[PDB]
Amino acid sequence: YEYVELAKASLTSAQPQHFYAVVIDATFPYKTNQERYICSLKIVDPTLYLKQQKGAGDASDYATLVLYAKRFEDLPIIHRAGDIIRVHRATLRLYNGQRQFNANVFYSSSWALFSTDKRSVTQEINNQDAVSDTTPFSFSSKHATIEKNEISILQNLRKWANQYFSSYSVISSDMYTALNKAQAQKGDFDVVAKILQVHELDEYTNELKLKDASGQVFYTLSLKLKFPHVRTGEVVRIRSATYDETSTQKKVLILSHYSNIITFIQSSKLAKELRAKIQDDHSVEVASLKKNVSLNAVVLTEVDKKHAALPSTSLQDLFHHADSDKELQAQDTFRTQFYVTKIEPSDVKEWVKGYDRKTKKSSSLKGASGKGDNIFQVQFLVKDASTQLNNNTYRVLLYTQDGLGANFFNVKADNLHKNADARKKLEDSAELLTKFNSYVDAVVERRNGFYLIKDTKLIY
Amino acid sequence: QQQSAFKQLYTELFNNEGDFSKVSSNLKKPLKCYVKESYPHFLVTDGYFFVAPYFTKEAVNEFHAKFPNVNIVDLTDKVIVINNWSLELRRVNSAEVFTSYANLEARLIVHSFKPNLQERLNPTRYPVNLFRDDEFKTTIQHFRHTALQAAINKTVKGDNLVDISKVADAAGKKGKVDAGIVKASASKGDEFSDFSFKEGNTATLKIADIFVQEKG
DNA sequence: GGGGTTTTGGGG
DNA sequence: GGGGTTTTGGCG
DNA sequence: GGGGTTTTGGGG
Ligand SMILES: [Cl-]
Ligand code: NA
Ligand code: NA
Ligand code: NA
Ligand code: NA
């Protein structure tokens, strides 16, 4: 197999050609009719990656690759910009002024994906190591062969990709639309924004809270199975979105089966600058709290920084599998999300009780100090997406006698029967916690079959 | 101002405990919609979303009477006008019914519809399943949240707080997490169902039967 | 022509 | 090919 | 044998 560079491929041969390239963009594989699937992508290499820079505006130049197939599984799922693709038997032609490489996978063409970073996106999600640095993490057909001579091409193209992404935006401003101008678009458009929040709407759907350089916030539904790599704080490029004219309560982007959400390789200058430049916004949440009913979700808490890297565990696993799952039995500390259905005791004034550290007993302060040290003894009855349909509610405790969750309310325990200020703040927090669309993000510690909140604080 | 007629209708139905009589009257006017599909699923759009209309055995017989030269299962890409219709809530298995959410479905019961054969409609966005919309899914979650909260505040009582000693000095104590599971209502099964709206009931035809009635 | 396959020389 | 399925109608 | 493809009947 002889590999040719993009700009040097023949436009007249019409013969099958082969090449290595870096993917900067791609649709998701999508069905067109009763027998055809398609995946369109934008590719570049050392010979084709930037338009005549003078009056070009540092715009990216590229070739396009269109892969056809009879089966969905015979096409590449591109989750990240910057990785490399190897194509065999592609025919080149000029389509509206640009180099279009076409390859029928259902015939004799084939492709193979190589990770530019240490691990592929899927391997990062599963915390897996790559077999080797010359192994395709994905490819068409039952086999893929890498000859010794290719190793240099791959290694060099990788080095090039990192220099390219770290020196240029790659996804230039002409490749997407500012979110605050989304409503002026006639049809679909592309987006480049930071994921501010990933809210599990239900069993198969995530609701992404996005914010781009224009400062505009938008929400969009992202299927879990299709886009399992979405992560809070990360910058992504969204290929093909439309402005939703029917959403009045909040700004919504609509995605299609061919739409794609793509992250950037570690070296991406654009991704790095946007992660730092774009800062979290809570304006939407602050405004929603003034409404009797908010169609916008509000995460009322934040976990200590030392847990930000801790993976979350659903209520289903926490209460229904924590005593039968090997992996869940080995952990005592978990992170989870849920909404509060009810708070006990009902009387907010009883949330703080006097505790006797010698008899391990607590009591009401309605009789005053004669009960010992003041502590919070609150029981949340919660629910989440994973348990949304069942007839259950789950108990999550806030028992701070040992220091766990003492600062949850940003209100030091005190006799609520006498401290009006403390009582009032807790009463307000109570209405917020039980309000529809309010959610909690918290770390819990398992103790004698119960879960106690810790290292978690309200931010409203 | 809601531009999607379907979204506004279905939203008010849910925000009014499935009581179709409580929904705005100025919304119960004839519905002119485009037929996206007709078989195996009959789907119509309002220019923004698509919904599945449920035809009564009467509605079809009337149709076949006033329009003998028109097969319903062949109305794809054609427009229709539903003059007499109603809306009701039904409990379904959303895992099988794609035109629903959280085991709940708002059905468009059609009593009378006229096919405006060969009427070209204005260009619109690609229609999406109303039950896949962010705001509408949220509207439905609000509905369940309210029913759930009312049931829980009625079922749960006596502040049965875990005794603090169980979580204090738990060095030599081991427990099963299912000890934290609390029943939300007096529901019979393992699925919450303590809703206050009265599930609508109306005989409707299966799109398959109307297919046979027009081409055995 | 050339794959994968078995048809192992020949259809459409 | 900057696009529109479905035994897949919450990867397609 | 049958796809896609053009070889349009025949290799290995
Ligand atoms: Cl335990
Ligand atoms: Na052959
Ligand atoms: Na053969
Ligand atoms: Na042949
Ligand atoms: Na042939």
XYZ file of C-alpha atoms (C1' of nucleotides) and ligand atoms in Angstrom:
717
model
C 0.000 0.000 0.000
C 1.338 3.399 -1.087
C 0.143 6.399 0.917
C -0.311 9.812 -0.706
C -0.644 13.243 0.899
C -3.967 15.047 0.483
C -2.793 17.903 -1.714
C -0.756 15.544 -3.898
C -3.446 12.935 -4.608
C -4.443 12.719 -8.279
C -7.663 14.337 -9.457
C -7.429 12.628 -12.835
C -6.432 9.047 -12.044
C -9.901 8.255 -10.678
C -8.044 5.171 -9.397
C -8.206 3.945 -5.804
C -5.791 5.921 -3.619
C -4.739 5.577 0.010
C -3.832 8.070 2.728
C -3.286 8.924 6.397
C -4.943 12.091 7.731
C -6.098 13.972 10.803
C -9.839 14.303 11.404
C -11.013 17.754 12.426
C -14.733 17.244 11.872
C -17.352 14.621 11.212
C -21.053 13.927 11.206
C -22.245 10.897 13.169
C -22.859 7.862 10.926
C -26.459 8.218 9.703
C -28.975 6.206 7.673
C -30.245 7.735 4.392
C -32.679 5.106 3.096
C -33.515 1.403 3.375
C -29.979 0.308 2.537
C -27.414 3.120 2.935
C -25.428 4.706 5.781
C -23.114 7.708 5.492
C -20.381 9.486 7.443
C -18.991 12.811 6.233
C -15.744 14.206 7.590
C -13.201 16.994 7.247
C -9.561 15.928 7.062
C -6.182 17.668 6.910
C -2.488 16.817 6.717
C 0.906 18.593 6.370
C 0.036 19.548 2.773
C -3.565 20.756 3.283
C -4.646 22.417 6.516
C -4.717 26.190 6.109
C -6.078 28.587 3.504
C -3.827 31.172 1.812
C -3.173 33.239 4.941
C -3.023 36.959 4.138
C -6.674 37.798 3.701
C -7.836 34.317 4.672
C -8.123 35.100 8.379
C -6.204 32.054 9.587
C -9.160 30.021 8.350
C -8.540 26.274 8.125
C -8.280 24.598 4.722
C -9.230 20.944 4.304
C -10.358 18.020 2.198
C -13.590 16.125 2.743
C -14.047 12.387 3.145
C -17.376 10.702 2.502
C -17.716 7.056 3.540
C -20.636 4.977 2.309
C -21.824 1.685 3.775
C -24.770 -0.718 3.939
C -24.444 -1.133 7.684
C -24.120 1.369 10.510
C -21.333 -0.623 12.091
C -19.115 -0.312 9.010
C -18.590 3.417 9.596
C -16.323 5.332 12.032
C -17.699 7.048 15.118
C -15.624 10.201 15.592
C -15.864 11.443 19.184
C -12.771 13.642 19.070
C -11.091 16.121 16.741
C -7.377 15.535 16.304
C -7.295 11.754 15.949
C -6.027 10.045 12.794
C -7.784 8.019 10.114
C -6.221 5.663 7.558
C -8.180 5.055 4.366
C -7.713 2.407 1.675
C -9.126 2.585 -1.837
C -10.687 6.064 -1.949
C -11.507 7.885 -5.209
C -10.805 11.606 -5.401
C -12.755 14.254 -7.264
C -13.421 17.956 -7.110
C -16.758 18.852 -5.507
C -17.610 22.531 -5.556
C -13.994 23.593 -5.558
C -12.721 21.235 -2.898
C -10.961 17.876 -2.776
C -13.568 15.205 -1.972
C -12.312 11.699 -1.194
C -15.040 9.093 -1.589
C -14.896 5.543 -0.297
C -17.491 2.784 -0.539
C -16.900 0.645 2.537
C -19.562 -1.770 1.332
C -17.288 -2.632 -1.569
C -13.516 -2.692 -1.289
C -12.666 0.399 0.732
C -11.643 0.364 4.374
C -10.699 2.713 7.180
C -8.847 2.610 10.487
C -8.704 5.089 13.392
C -5.575 5.844 15.403
C -5.502 7.766 18.653
C -3.404 10.925 18.648
C -3.411 11.127 22.431
C -2.294 8.192 24.599
C -5.786 6.760 24.764
C -8.822 6.920 22.495
C -11.957 8.551 23.890
C -13.572 5.189 24.623
C -10.427 3.938 26.364
C -10.412 7.089 28.527
C -14.020 6.502 29.529
C -13.257 2.928 30.545
C -9.816 3.709 31.962
C -8.145 1.285 29.555
C -4.603 1.348 28.158
C -3.965 1.055 24.411
C -2.568 -2.261 23.185
C 0.310 -0.339 21.579
C 0.955 2.954 19.822
C 0.483 1.308 16.430
C -2.861 -0.351 17.100
C -6.041 1.094 15.549
C -8.683 1.550 18.248
C -11.356 1.059 15.564
C -11.502 -0.144 11.943
C -13.755 -1.485 9.180
C -13.910 -5.149 8.149
C -12.607 -8.039 10.293
C -8.893 -7.224 9.982
C -6.462 -4.288 9.798
C -2.768 -4.564 8.921
C -0.036 -2.097 9.864
C 3.264 -2.606 7.991
C 6.613 -1.651 9.578
C 7.061 1.219 7.126
C 3.805 2.860 8.276
C 5.001 3.345 11.831
C 7.038 6.400 10.784
C 4.096 7.935 8.911
C 1.809 7.486 11.910
C 4.345 8.703 14.478
C 5.177 11.748 12.360
C 1.540 12.600 11.609
C 0.874 12.451 15.364
C 3.694 14.847 16.093
C 2.339 17.082 13.346
C -1.225 16.939 14.699
C -0.087 18.133 18.125
C 1.918 21.008 16.637
C -1.097 21.891 14.472
C -3.690 21.867 17.247
C -1.396 23.740 19.664
C -0.479 26.433 17.115
C -3.838 26.954 15.424
C -7.489 26.920 16.394
C -8.139 24.215 13.746
C -11.840 24.874 14.138
C -11.642 28.494 12.925
C -14.334 31.124 13.494
C -15.745 30.477 10.043
C -16.633 26.946 11.139
C -19.277 27.781 13.733
C -21.817 30.350 14.882
C -21.896 32.439 18.063
C -24.698 31.179 20.313
C -26.030 34.690 20.776
C -26.599 34.854 16.999
C -28.084 31.352 16.699
C -31.607 32.742 16.267
C -30.519 34.651 13.139
C -29.550 31.447 11.279
C -31.846 30.256 8.468
C -31.164 26.563 9.005
C -28.683 24.492 10.989
C -25.263 25.646 12.170
C -22.299 24.506 14.235
C -21.274 25.407 17.790
C -18.099 25.533 19.869
C -18.767 25.783 23.589
C -17.895 24.651 27.066
C -20.056 22.111 28.860
C -21.066 23.864 32.083
C -23.306 21.056 33.293
C -24.467 17.532 32.439
C -27.925 16.948 33.905
C -29.359 13.434 33.656
C -32.862 14.096 32.425
C -33.850 10.417 32.323
C -32.662 6.852 31.630
C -31.418 7.608 28.096
C -30.987 11.365 27.949
C -28.560 13.976 29.258
C -29.338 17.676 29.159
C -26.217 19.695 28.431
C -25.892 23.265 29.658
C -23.621 25.025 27.178
C -21.937 28.416 27.117
C -19.672 29.713 24.342
C -17.350 32.692 23.850
C -20.288 35.022 23.211
C -21.433 34.430 26.781
C -24.822 32.984 25.748
C -26.171 29.933 27.561
C -28.043 27.175 25.721
C -29.364 23.756 26.649
C -29.522 20.719 24.371
C -30.487 17.045 24.751
C -27.618 14.594 24.377
C -28.425 10.864 24.289
C -26.236 8.886 26.713
C -25.512 6.026 24.338
C -24.632 8.270 21.400
C -22.464 10.752 23.320
C -21.038 8.952 26.412
C -17.993 11.222 26.438
C -19.683 14.472 27.496
C -18.031 15.864 30.637
C -18.537 18.988 32.717
C -15.879 21.663 32.145
C -14.876 20.298 28.750
C -15.007 22.119 25.452
C -16.770 20.519 22.493
C -17.671 21.297 18.908
C -21.221 20.506 17.956
C -21.712 19.630 14.298
C -25.228 20.605 13.182
C -27.705 22.264 15.511
C -30.840 24.342 14.980
C -32.358 27.061 17.138
C -35.586 25.900 18.808
C -38.332 28.465 18.189
C -40.798 26.575 20.378
C -38.802 26.872 23.597
C -39.898 29.939 25.478
C -38.692 29.127 29.001
C -35.095 28.536 27.953
C -32.720 28.673 24.997
C -32.609 25.258 23.358
C -30.545 23.754 20.541
C -32.037 20.824 18.592
C -29.770 18.036 17.363
C -30.448 15.459 14.629
C -29.443 11.826 14.156
C -26.557 13.010 11.952
C -25.418 15.686 14.461
C -22.165 15.061 16.340
C -20.584 16.296 19.578
C -16.805 16.325 19.433
C -14.077 16.987 21.998
C -10.507 18.085 21.263
C -7.155 16.388 21.641
C -5.115 17.473 24.681
C -2.914 19.795 22.594
C -5.826 21.917 21.298
C -5.032 25.585 21.719
C -8.680 26.447 21.160
C -9.946 23.986 23.767
C -7.379 25.186 26.306
C -8.226 28.873 25.841
C -11.969 28.230 26.025
C -11.750 26.077 29.145
C -10.060 29.058 30.856
C -11.936 31.927 29.222
C -15.516 30.667 29.523
C -16.664 30.855 33.115
C -19.562 29.138 34.811
C -22.814 31.047 34.842
C -25.595 30.823 37.425
C -27.711 33.675 36.121
C -30.300 31.251 34.743
C -30.517 29.455 38.089
C -30.812 32.668 40.087
C -33.646 33.827 37.859
C -35.478 30.505 37.995
C -35.636 30.586 41.778
C -37.952 33.591 41.497
C -40.523 31.576 39.545
C -43.128 29.302 41.119
C -42.276 26.732 38.451
C -38.958 26.608 36.617
C -38.480 24.501 33.499
C -34.760 24.936 34.102
C -32.872 22.526 36.358
C -30.909 23.937 39.293
C -28.090 22.065 41.023
C -28.214 23.568 44.540
C -24.924 22.161 45.796
C -21.268 21.602 45.042
C -18.866 18.984 46.315
C -15.409 19.635 47.755
C -12.747 19.999 45.048
C -11.096 16.756 46.154
C -14.168 14.865 44.918
C -14.682 16.663 41.596
C -12.892 13.736 39.947
C -15.041 11.130 41.679
C -17.479 9.255 39.403
C -21.174 9.332 40.249
C -23.336 6.423 41.361
C -27.081 6.279 40.749
C -29.660 5.693 43.476
C -30.538 2.386 41.809
C -27.022 1.046 42.401
C -26.664 2.724 45.809
C -29.828 1.256 47.309
C -30.436 -1.852 45.187
C -26.971 -3.179 44.299
C -24.527 -1.856 46.921
C -24.821 -5.147 48.827
C -24.519 -7.485 45.842
C -22.093 -5.759 43.446
C -18.403 -6.503 44.000
C -17.310 -3.021 42.920
C -19.924 -1.249 45.037
C -19.133 -3.370 48.110
C -15.508 -2.203 48.116
C -16.345 1.517 48.394
C -17.629 3.416 51.433
C -17.680 6.876 49.841
C -19.826 7.693 46.791
C -20.956 10.688 44.742
C -24.509 10.886 43.463
C -27.285 13.191 42.260
C -30.944 13.367 43.238
C -33.860 15.619 44.039
C -35.461 15.936 47.470
C -39.108 14.832 47.663
C -39.597 15.468 51.366
C -37.519 16.534 54.379
C -37.862 15.095 57.874
C -38.555 16.120 60.511
C -41.323 18.301 59.035
C -40.808 21.089 61.573
C -37.637 22.900 60.465
C -37.138 23.939 64.099
C -36.432 20.278 64.935
C -33.653 19.954 62.342
C -31.166 20.805 65.071
C -31.146 18.589 68.136
C -29.081 18.459 71.287
C -26.707 15.501 71.297
C -25.168 13.609 74.220
C -21.872 12.084 73.066
C -21.877 9.659 75.998
C -25.298 8.037 75.579
C -25.342 8.476 71.797
C -28.800 10.049 72.127
C -30.278 13.220 70.670
C -33.220 15.294 71.866
C -35.384 18.307 71.106
C -34.081 21.749 72.028
C -37.577 23.042 72.620
C -36.494 22.568 76.233
C -33.143 24.293 75.575
C -29.425 23.572 76.192
C -30.150 20.656 78.536
C -29.541 18.260 75.650
C -25.831 18.664 74.871
C -23.925 19.729 71.746
C -26.093 21.014 68.891
C -26.165 18.976 65.706
C -28.124 18.590 62.517
C -30.268 15.461 62.292
C -31.980 15.752 58.930
C -33.364 12.962 56.773
C -33.873 13.587 53.084
C -36.300 11.399 51.156
C -34.846 11.459 47.603
C -35.313 10.140 44.059
C -33.390 10.240 40.771
C -33.533 9.350 37.068
C -32.549 5.700 37.601
C -35.435 5.201 40.054
C -37.834 7.703 38.506
C -40.608 5.227 37.706
C -40.575 2.945 40.754
C -42.768 3.440 43.826
C -39.826 4.224 46.090
C -38.186 7.165 47.761
C -34.773 6.858 49.414
C -33.344 8.082 52.677
C -30.223 10.206 52.653
C -29.045 11.473 56.021
C -27.500 14.683 57.277
C -26.319 13.697 60.774
C -23.442 15.996 61.650
C -22.639 14.913 65.205
C -19.254 13.612 63.979
C -18.574 16.492 61.647
C -19.981 14.991 58.448
C -21.907 17.586 56.467
C -21.751 20.170 59.282
C -21.507 23.072 56.814
C -24.087 21.747 54.331
C -26.499 24.618 54.969
C -23.838 27.316 55.334
C -25.483 27.688 58.742
C -23.728 26.426 61.881
C -26.059 24.260 63.983
C -27.936 26.269 66.605
C -31.149 26.209 68.617
C -33.653 26.991 65.855
C -36.292 27.601 68.531
C -34.316 30.692 69.602
C -32.108 31.802 66.687
C -34.588 33.361 64.264
C -31.887 34.146 61.733
C -30.757 30.526 61.520
C -34.329 29.246 61.456
C -35.282 31.532 58.570
C -32.283 30.588 56.408
C -33.046 26.895 56.843
C -36.744 27.393 56.105
C -35.789 29.071 52.803
C -33.352 26.287 51.937
C -36.130 23.799 52.677
C -38.483 25.374 50.108
C -35.657 25.373 47.564
C -34.758 21.694 48.138
C -38.299 20.380 47.725
C -39.066 22.667 44.744
C -39.511 20.970 41.364
C -36.361 20.973 39.207
C -34.051 21.519 42.190
C -31.346 18.864 42.402
C -28.506 17.928 44.756
C -24.969 16.856 43.812
C -23.369 15.238 46.830
C -20.766 12.915 48.201
C -22.057 10.389 50.737
C -20.376 7.985 53.138
C -21.909 4.598 53.812
C -22.321 3.820 57.494
C -24.239 0.889 59.006
C -26.430 0.547 55.925
C -27.157 4.273 55.715
C -25.751 7.091 53.583
C -24.624 10.334 55.232
C -23.870 13.515 53.312
C -20.399 15.036 53.587
C -18.117 17.512 51.821
C -21.166 19.081 50.204
C -22.535 22.605 50.517
C -25.449 24.603 49.198
C -24.408 27.361 46.793
C -27.699 29.259 46.967
C -45.980 32.891 22.912
C -45.902 29.224 21.951
C -45.654 28.769 18.187
C -46.299 25.012 18.265
C -50.028 24.427 18.575
C -49.483 20.832 19.671
C -46.921 21.784 22.306
C -49.182 24.446 23.770
C -52.179 22.104 23.835
C -50.444 19.089 25.330
C -48.639 21.340 27.808
C -51.835 22.860 29.160
C -53.428 19.428 29.406
C -50.614 18.263 31.718
C -50.512 21.548 33.631
C -54.232 21.020 34.277
C -54.175 17.492 35.731
C -55.207 15.971 32.414
C -58.554 17.767 32.626
C -59.377 18.627 29.004
C -62.254 20.854 30.147
C -59.826 23.105 32.018
C -57.639 23.801 28.977
C -58.128 27.161 27.253
C -61.212 27.222 25.031
C -59.504 29.449 22.461
C -57.356 26.415 21.638
C -60.156 23.979 20.816
C -60.428 25.207 17.222
C -59.996 23.034 14.089
C -56.484 21.675 13.559
C -54.911 21.866 10.110
C -51.876 19.597 10.055
C -49.442 18.006 7.607
C -49.333 14.210 7.405
C -45.684 13.190 7.861
C -46.344 9.448 7.846
C -49.405 7.207 7.534
C -48.078 3.658 7.939
C -46.927 1.780 9.957
C -47.354 4.921 12.080
C -49.768 7.716 11.237
C -47.952 10.897 12.252
C -49.021 14.504 11.697
C -47.144 17.745 12.321
C -48.083 21.312 13.188
C -44.986 22.721 11.558
C -42.751 22.006 14.575
C -43.624 18.663 16.183
C -45.356 15.457 15.184
C -48.031 13.618 17.154
C -50.032 10.452 16.625
C -53.777 11.090 16.178
C -56.120 8.368 17.461
C -59.134 7.763 15.203
C -62.458 6.479 16.527
C -64.313 3.831 14.513
C -66.897 6.540 13.824
C -64.386 9.082 12.523
C -63.112 6.627 9.895
C -66.525 5.422 8.720
C -67.547 9.051 8.274
C -64.347 9.689 6.329
C -64.837 6.676 4.048
C -68.379 7.924 3.463
C -67.641 11.504 2.435
C -64.427 10.489 0.675
C -64.702 7.085 -1.076
C -61.840 7.942 -3.416
C -59.454 8.522 -0.502
C -57.513 5.927 1.493
C -56.301 7.164 4.884
C -53.212 4.941 4.894
C -52.127 6.783 1.725
C -52.419 10.356 3.012
C -48.660 10.747 3.488
C -47.396 14.153 2.353
C -51.023 15.291 2.208
C -52.794 17.703 4.565
C -55.841 17.083 6.749
C -58.201 19.181 8.840
C -59.403 17.823 12.175
C -62.669 19.652 12.899
C -63.817 17.642 15.900
C -61.183 16.451 18.375
C -60.384 15.999 22.065
C -57.360 15.351 24.320
C -56.929 12.880 27.171
C -54.206 11.387 29.360
C -53.405 7.684 29.335
C -50.974 5.450 31.190
C -48.730 3.512 28.820
C -45.433 1.660 28.610
C -43.109 4.322 27.192
C -40.601 1.550 26.495
C -42.952 0.436 23.717
C -44.855 3.613 22.821
C -42.470 6.189 21.357
C -45.210 8.817 21.403
C -45.132 9.071 25.214
C -42.874 9.853 28.179
C -42.443 8.503 31.717
C -45.263 6.029 31.075
C -47.677 8.859 30.383
C -49.248 9.888 27.082
C -51.446 12.766 26.005
C -53.611 11.469 23.127
C -55.197 13.489 20.317
C -58.602 11.835 19.932
C -59.914 12.584 16.437
C -63.677 12.538 15.868
C -63.822 14.180 12.424
C -61.172 15.134 9.856
C -61.278 16.386 6.248
C -58.467 15.755 3.722
C -57.583 18.952 1.828
C -56.229 16.909 -1.080
C -53.344 18.521 -2.952
C -52.912 21.611 -0.756
C -49.260 22.617 -0.616
C -48.123 23.711 2.836
C -45.497 26.314 3.770
C -41.853 25.243 4.294
C -41.091 24.354 7.917
C -38.359 22.916 10.116
C -37.959 19.135 10.331
C -40.713 17.868 12.730
C -39.608 16.217 15.961
C -41.373 13.857 18.360
C -43.088 16.194 20.829
C -42.373 13.635 23.544
C -38.634 14.077 22.976
C -38.688 17.856 23.479
C -36.717 19.239 26.447
C -39.374 21.643 27.743
C -42.216 19.182 27.260
C -40.364 16.307 28.936
C -39.677 18.724 31.801
C -43.330 19.746 31.869
C -44.211 16.085 32.257
C -41.607 15.580 34.982
C -43.198 18.533 36.815
C -46.535 16.770 36.590
C -45.154 13.582 38.144
C -43.158 15.529 40.723
C -46.368 17.094 41.988
C -48.264 13.790 42.122
C -45.296 12.102 43.795
C -44.819 14.806 46.389
C -48.515 14.808 47.322
C -48.497 11.035 47.716
C -45.307 11.019 49.786
C -46.516 13.767 52.135
C -49.659 11.696 52.645
C -48.005 8.271 52.951
C -44.959 9.201 55.041
C -45.644 10.361 58.591
C -44.456 10.274 62.200
C -40.939 11.491 61.410
C -39.472 7.988 61.595
C -35.921 9.328 61.684
C -33.102 6.812 61.772
C -31.975 6.715 65.408
C -28.754 8.707 65.624
C -27.037 5.873 67.543
C -27.175 3.654 64.434
C -24.915 6.084 62.563
C -22.910 7.096 65.638
C -20.359 4.614 66.951
C -20.793 2.400 63.886
C -17.371 0.784 64.256
C -18.847 -2.620 65.039
C -22.058 -2.074 63.107
C -22.944 -3.397 59.668
C -26.152 -2.720 57.767
C -27.944 -3.323 54.474
C -28.580 -0.247 52.348
C -32.109 -1.357 51.511
C -32.899 -0.209 55.039
C -33.142 3.234 53.485
C -35.865 2.295 51.020
C -39.210 3.959 51.752
C -42.496 3.351 49.905
C -43.786 6.527 48.260
C -47.439 5.565 48.180
C -50.001 2.857 48.724
C -49.530 1.841 45.088
C -50.157 -1.819 44.329
C -47.096 -2.529 42.207
C -43.443 -1.541 42.074
C -44.389 1.404 39.839
C -45.668 4.722 41.206
C -49.268 5.262 40.118
C -50.969 7.384 42.772
C -52.148 10.090 40.356
C -55.209 12.314 40.828
C -56.155 12.872 37.188
C -58.777 10.435 35.958
C -57.354 8.381 33.119
C -59.342 9.130 29.995
C -61.076 6.252 28.248
C -62.156 6.066 24.620
C -62.187 3.265 22.062
C -59.750 3.998 19.263
C -58.729 2.106 16.131
C -55.336 0.509 15.568
C -53.626 1.903 12.472
C -53.322 -1.713 11.323
C -57.073 -2.377 11.276
C -57.679 0.685 9.116
C -55.038 -0.721 6.765
C -56.973 -3.962 6.317
C -60.273 -2.100 5.997
C -58.764 -0.391 2.940
C -56.627 -3.242 1.569
C -57.083 -6.644 3.222
C -10.312 -7.463 -11.634
C -10.344 -8.930 -7.356
C -12.899 -10.440 -2.112
C -14.142 -14.016 0.419
C -15.371 -18.236 -0.379
C -16.294 -22.756 -2.234
C -18.824 -21.120 -6.420
C -13.107 -24.095 -7.418
C -15.850 -22.043 -13.513
C -19.165 -18.844 -14.455
C -24.346 -14.577 -13.648
C -26.317 -10.237 -13.990
C -21.447 15.047 -0.038
C -23.973 20.642 5.123
C -27.417 15.240 5.733
C -33.695 12.953 7.636
C -33.727 6.054 9.566
C -36.817 3.324 12.661
C -36.573 -5.304 13.675
C -33.126 1.462 15.913
C -39.192 5.165 16.240
C -34.161 7.538 23.347
C -26.366 5.606 18.829
C -28.272 4.929 13.597
C -22.765 -17.616 -5.763
C -23.340 -13.022 -5.523
C -21.628 -7.337 -4.867
C -20.055 -3.903 -6.890
C -18.434 -2.675 -10.887
C -17.242 -2.541 -15.595
C -14.063 -7.058 -15.617
C -19.394 -7.277 -19.243
C -16.069 -13.434 -19.229
C -12.964 -15.294 -16.373
C -8.253 -15.733 -11.557
C -6.586 -17.772 -7.657
Cl -22.600 -0.821 56.282
Na -15.654 -14.695 -8.462
Na -14.557 -17.914 -6.534
Na -17.330 -11.395 -10.746
Na -18.301 -8.534 -13.114
